[PDB]
């Protein structure tokens, strides 16, 4: 008997979680979970396979859904309404878009990586670069090989982390000081990429 519901604040900046609603609902770790966003179709969010999903900028104004599957039974869930905007985000991105801009970050994957070393994540008009002091870690011009999106798993920092695949086989997970910086960096990168005729999105995004 599959009975679950999506809980959490339905706005950019928070996390949503599937929660059990009955005593005999199997544990979610034994289920297969897949998150989707409405387009009247639903589009799969690739890699969003955990019981927690943090919305990112593409999710704003969309209903989110989770399918949960166990042993041939399935249940399709939806948020109460569309994911709301983050207050002030548009205006902040508009101020950043005039500039040719960097963010303090921590790198949490390149394999796991626990460092308190602050790196700088430069989102430029034509390229992104990741630096630790004077050492450049990776530097790439916007292209079809690059992906950039909100991270698709759990953890307390998911709403403030993004995934960047610089080019095939080279990817990072990066965490910002706040949700607002994380989201502004995704929106800004995407806008600069679109000016360069590149559609910068996460793996399999539509």
């Amino acid at each position: 008997s599959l009975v679950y519901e999506i809980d959490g604040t339905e706005a950019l900046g928070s996390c949503l979680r599937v929660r059990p609603c009955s005593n005999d609902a199997p544990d979610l770790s034994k289920c297969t979970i897949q998150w989707y966003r409405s387009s009247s179709k639903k589009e799969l969010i690739s890699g969003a396979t955990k019981s927690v999903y943090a919305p990112e900028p593409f999710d704003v104004g969309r209903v989110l859904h989770a399918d949960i599957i166990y042993d041939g039974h399935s249940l399709s869930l939806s948020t109460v309404g569309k994911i709301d905007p983050a207050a002030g985000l548009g205006s902040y991105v508009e101020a950043l878009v005039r500039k040719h801009v960097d963010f303090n970050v921590v790198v949490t994957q390149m394999e796991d990586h626990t460092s308190e070393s602050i790196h700088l994540f430069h989102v430029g008009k034509m390229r992104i670069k990741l630096c630790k002091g004077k050492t450049v870690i990776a530097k790439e011009y916007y292209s079809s090989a690059m992906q950039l999106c909100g991270v698709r798993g759990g953890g307390n920092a998911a709403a403030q982390a993004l995934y960047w695949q610089a080019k095939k086989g080279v990817s990072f997970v990066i965490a910002f000081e706040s949700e607002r910086e994380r989201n502004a960096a995704i929106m800004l990168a995407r806008r600069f990429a679109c000016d360069c005729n590149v559609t910068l999105a996460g793996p399999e995004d539509r």
């Binding site: 690739s46 890699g47 969003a48 396979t49 955990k50 303090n104 921590v106 949490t108 994957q109 796991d112 602050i118 999106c149 991270v151 698709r152 798993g153 759990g154 953890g155 307390n156 920092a157 998911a158 403030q160 982390a161 995934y163 695949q165 990817s171 990072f172 997970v173 965490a175 000081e177 996460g202 793996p203």
Partner: peptide, 12 residues
């Protein structure tokens, strides 16, 4: 990419 879905934790 397993990375895209790993838990992200902080304790900046």
């Amino acid at each position: 990419d397993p990375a895209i879905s790993k838990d992200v934790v902080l304790s900046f």
